[PDB]
């Protein structure tokens, strides 16, 4: 089961990379809402960053979390320069999408999907 | 040979027409429904039956390579005519 690493040998170094990336993202959110002229507050952007980080909190394999750190750094570099648009930044906020059913009864009313 | 429903909307050869309570009729309001009035079944029913003098016949639709693949029709039944599967022409043995 001995496999080639990506950047970190164990989970502590991967956690260190996660922490550094999240620090840099937390720095970036005010410039992101300033340059792109979003109408959201800085607190809303920081909660969105925290939610996107918490969406991957159950994974304990070093290689895949290294790959997610790589992808997050790629998106950070994409946002540092103006390569995203306003629409690419606000695609993290699904404002146009209607709220979906959550309980069993509303799903039973709306259709046959589970 | 087009036929009109009681709502005033015509019926195509496929038999499709909209009901009175159908909301999809609103696409024809201020416009018109495109329906072809040359119904092929009536025009192929008016072709005369060709009387031939053999048990089997061959049909190609007329024109050779401009028609359908050449099929062979049996005429052993004295009750019904032998209809071509492609063009719909019917042939009949004279005995």
């Amino acid at each position: 089961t001995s496999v080639k690493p990506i950047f970190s040998r164990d989970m502590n170094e991967a956690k260190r990379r996660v922490r550094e990336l999240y620090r840099a993202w937390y720095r970036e959110v005010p410039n992101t809402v300033h340059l792109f002229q979003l109408d959201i507050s800085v607190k809303q952007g920081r909660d969105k960053v925290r939610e996107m980080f918490k969406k991957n909190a159950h994974v304990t394999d070093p290689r895949v979390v290294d790959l997610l750190v790589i992808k997050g750094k790629m998106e950070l570099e994409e946002t540092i320069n103006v390569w995203k648009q306003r629409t690419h930044v606000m695609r993290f906020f699904h404002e146009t999408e209607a709220p979906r059913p959550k309980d069993f009864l509303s799903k039973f009313y709306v259709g046959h999907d589970p | 040979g087009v036929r009109t429903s009681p709502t005033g909307e015509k019926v195509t050869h496929t038999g499709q027409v909209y009901d009175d309570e159908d909301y999809r009729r609103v696409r024809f309001v201020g416009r018109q429904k495109e329906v072809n009035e040359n119904f092929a079944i009536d025009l192929i029913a008016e072709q005369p039956v060709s009387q031939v003098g053999s048990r089997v016949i061959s049909c190609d639709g007329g024109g050779g390579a401009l028609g359908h693949p050449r099929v062979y029709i049996n005429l052993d039944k004295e009750t019904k005519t032998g209809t071509c599967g492609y063009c719909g022409l019917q042939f009949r043995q004279q005995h």
């Binding site: 069993f104 009864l105 039973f108 046959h112 589970p114 | -």
Partner: protein
Amino acid sequence: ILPGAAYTEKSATYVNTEGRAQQTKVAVMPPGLAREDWKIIRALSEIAGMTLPYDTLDQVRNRLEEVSPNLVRYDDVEGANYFQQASELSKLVNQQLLADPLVPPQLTIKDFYMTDSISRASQTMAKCVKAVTE
């Protein structure tokens, strides 16, 4: 009237006469507002305030295993022993045999095409019955 589904419209389990469990698959979806049957019963139990402890099909199948473990192992025939106990129990009540001869309900081919509601509502079955009766 509660519109349910059909055997081509839901994923569901049926057991044949030999004790073999099998599962259908969803080929199409029910039309209109028709829903799955266990979904209808579960929604009724939710509205009535007696809510059942299952929401997805896998939880209903786990309950099915809980009631009878042989209802969740598909394409498998399980052995049913202990004929002697049933034979000894069946000798208690002395039912008297009637004098009516054994006449099956299906004597000719015209009694074969119409058995359930799906076959009774078919035009092919009606054509077959009209063809075999004449």
